[PDB]
Design a protein around this ligand. Sequence first.
Ligand code: HC4
Length: 125
Amino acid sequence: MEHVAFGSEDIENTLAKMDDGQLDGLAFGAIQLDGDGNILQYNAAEGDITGRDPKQVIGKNFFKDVAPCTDSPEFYGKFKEGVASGNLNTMFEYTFDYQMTPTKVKVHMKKALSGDSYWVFVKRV
Ligand SMILES: *C(=O)/C=C/c1ccc(O)cc1
C-alpha cells in the first residue's frame, strides 16, 4: 500500500507525488479528471470496484461514456459547478449501476492542488 486515508484533509497534497503506479497502491479508488471530465488517471482499486480496465478508460470522458449513471445534478452537476468555480470539495454516497451489479459507494471529489484537474475518490459502503 500507499498509506493515505479516504477523506484526508490534505489528500490533494499527498496525491500530487503519485504516478500511475503509486496511485495503484491506494486503499480506495482514485480517478483524476480534467475540467471536461476526461480521465487522466484511473487506479487499480477503482477497477476492482467497478470492473473497468484502467488503461482502457484513460482518455475517455467519464460523464459521457464511462459513467452515464453519474450524468445527473447529484454527481456531474456538482463536478461541473466545481470546475466552473475553480474550487471543489464534496463527499456523498452514490450507486453505480451501469452494465454492472449496482454498487453503493462513498464518493469524494476534490480539486487537485496544481493546474486545473479534479480527483474522484471512491470506496465501498
Ligand atoms: C454509472 O454509470 C457509474 C459508472 C462508473 C462509475 C465509476 C467508474 O470508475 C466507472 C464507471
